[PDB]
């Protein structure tokens, strides 16, 4: 199973995942693929932040699924 982390500055990060994989974990993919800390890190799908204890079954995320990545918003 391979899903795409996909920005909005158009660059797309394929990971290799399984079903019972965590947000967690795949935030900590992309931390090591991107450097960017887990806590900075917003995972969106079905118009859902994901959140680090639920897995990527729990989200009904699919073989080849994309997932938007964008930086938490700070500065208000
Ligand atoms: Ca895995
Ligand atoms: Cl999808």
């Not at 795409?4 to 935030?27: A, Q, Y």
């Not at 806590?39 to 729990?58: M, N, V, W």
């Given at each position: 199973?391979?899903?795409?982390?996909?920005?909005?500055?158009?660059?797309?990060?394929?990971?290799?995942?399984?079903?019972?994989?965590?947000?967690?974990?795949?935030?900590?993919?992309?931390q090591?693929?991107?450097?960017?800390?887990?806590?900075?890190?917003?995972?969106?799908?079905?118009?859902?932040?994901?959140?680090?204890?639920?897995?990527?079954?729990?989200?009904?995320?699919?073989?080849?699924?994309?997932?938007?990545?964008?930086?938490?918003?700070?500065?208000?």
């Open positions: 199973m391979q899903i795409f982390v996909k920005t909005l500055t158009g660059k797309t990060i394929t990971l290799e995942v399984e079903p019972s994989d965590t947000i967690e974990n795949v935030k900590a993919k992309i090591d693929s991107e450097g960017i800390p887990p806590d900075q890190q917003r995972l969106i799908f079905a118009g859902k932040q994901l959140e680090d204890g639920r897995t990527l079954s729990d989200y009904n995320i699919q073989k080849e699924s994309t997932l938007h990545l964008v930086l938490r918003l700070r500065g208000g």
